[PDB]
């Protein structure tokens, strides 16, 4: 961002960024720039997530077209210079440099293109310098009419207006590159725990439950495996398990007799919230007995109840 010089929209320079961290909120809370429009993610959320790299992309255009910097948005530049997908993810950053790049005469430096035989696919730069041809007869290479060099020079003026004031653009890619995580936000690690239902963010993945020791093996690259439904059950070592989800049935003599009641708890081990366990769970408010009757109120697995 402090890079003095910026490449051109037709040679829009780009950079990988891994093995690092990003106190992004600054870029949001600096406010020194015009646009920090963030698709894909929530600008005010980029501290807890994280990724493995960032394709940092920087180019320059007129503010007139930063709107052209929008996925699925049509724009000659956006059509023949720089393309975004229909399913991009990331944030667009672009800012005026009239103060830093303008000079009397039209700064003829920042070169840009007009034509093409086709529209570029996303992130598919094109540097070509071949002579654009609109005439059936190929010039092979005498530019002029129906035989064209493809690029024009903005030539920004110290006075030029807003839509012609030059705004620098930087574009960030956070493409949920999940396999390992290497580039991450600012956060304070915490001490692991087991045998207690706890929320978690292991390398960017939110869940909750209990954390018990794994017994299986992974490989020197493997970060996690999921059992079915794409449900992770181990991370970096541990196996995962939810914490108990059970059902609640209330038992009674029927009101007309009383207001006293029984508590059912399903498929649970009531040590894990007088008492009584079954193949149906555990029961709070009743007594296991040794007598023998007919079944009035059924629980299951053999356990009925009455007065």
């Amino acid at each position: 961002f402090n890079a003095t010089r910026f490449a051109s929209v037709y040679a829009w320079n780009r950079k990988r960024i891994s093995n690092c961290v990003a106190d992004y909120s600054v870029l949001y809370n600096s406010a020194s720039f015009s646009t920090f429009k963030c698709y894909g993610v929530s600008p005010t959320k980029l501290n807890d997530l994280c990724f493995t790299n960032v394709y940092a992309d920087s180019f320059v255009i007129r503010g007139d077209e930063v709107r052209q910097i929008a996925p699925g948005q049509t724009g000659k530049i956006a059509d023949y210079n720089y393309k975004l997908p229909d399913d991009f993810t990331g944030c667009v950053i672009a800012w005026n440099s009239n103060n830093l790049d303008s000079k009397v005469g039209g700064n003829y430096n920042y070169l840009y293109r007009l034509f093409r035989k086709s529209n570029l696919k996303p992130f598919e730069r094109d540097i070509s310098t071949e002579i654009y041809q609109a005439g059936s007869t190929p010039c092979n290479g005498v530019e002029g009419f129906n035989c064209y060099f493809p690029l024009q020079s903005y030539g920004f003026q110290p006075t030029n207006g807003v839509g012609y004031q030059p705004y620098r653009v930087v574009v960030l890619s956070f493409e949920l590159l999940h396999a390992p995580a290497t580039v991450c936000g600012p956060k304070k690690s915490t001490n692991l725990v087991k045998n207690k239902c706890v929320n978690f963010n292991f390398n960017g993945l939110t869940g909750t439950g209990v954390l018990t020791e794994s017994n299986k093996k992974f490989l020197p690259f493997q970060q996690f495996g999921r059992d079915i439904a794409d449900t992770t059950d181990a991370v970096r070592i541990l196996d995962i398990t939810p914490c108990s989800f059970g059902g609640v049935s209330v038992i009674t003599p029927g009101t007309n007799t009383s207001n006293q009641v029984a508590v059912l708890y399903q498929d649970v081990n009531c040590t894990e919230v007088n008492v009584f366990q079954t193949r149906a769970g555990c029961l709070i408010g009743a007594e296991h007995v040794n007598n023998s009757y007919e079944c009035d109120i059924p629980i299951g697995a053999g356990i009925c109840a009455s007065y």
């Epitope: 007009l114 654009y132 530019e143 060099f149 690029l151």
Partner: nanobody, 125 residues
Framework: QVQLVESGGGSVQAGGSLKLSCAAS?????????IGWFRQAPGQEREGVAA????????YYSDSVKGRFTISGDNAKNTVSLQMNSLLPKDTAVYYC?????????????????WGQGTQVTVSS
């Protein structure tokens, strides 16, 4: 299809400064030429006044204009301007927009050159 909107014509005392203009817009520069003018004479033909490489600083200038006139334009604004400074009286003739082609030297010939109707520019005295 290549038009040359002229501006700045008319009479002027001998020894003045001015800004004439030549503009092309909505054209999608293909991609960058040199741009300048010529000067025909009521009796004599046109003269090679100057050139300037579209969207580029490189330029040409005539011995007369090269000292008291400067051709300056804005492709963002899509025009050019040969500053009519010092307005020599000899500058008494209709001045013509001239579209030099992809090459800057070619204009030196000027035959295929595109033109604007021609701003009559008499430098009166």
């Amino acid at each position: 299809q290549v038009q040359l909107v002229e501006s700045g014509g008319g009479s002027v005392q001998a020894g003045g400064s001015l800004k004439l203009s030549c503009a092309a817009s909505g054209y999608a520069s293909w991609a960058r030429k040199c741009i300048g003018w010529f000067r025909q004479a009521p009796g004599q033909e046109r003269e090679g006044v100057a050139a300037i490489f579209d969207f580029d600083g490189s330029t040409y200038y005539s011995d007369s204009v090269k000292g008291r006139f400067t051709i300056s334009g804005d492709n963002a604004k899509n025009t050019v301007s040969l500053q009519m400074n010092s307005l020599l009286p000899k500058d008494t003739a209709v001045y013509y927009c001239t579209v030099a082609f992809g090459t800057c030297d070619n204009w030196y010939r000027g035959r295929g050159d595109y033109w604007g109707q021609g701003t009559q520019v008499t430098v009166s005295s």
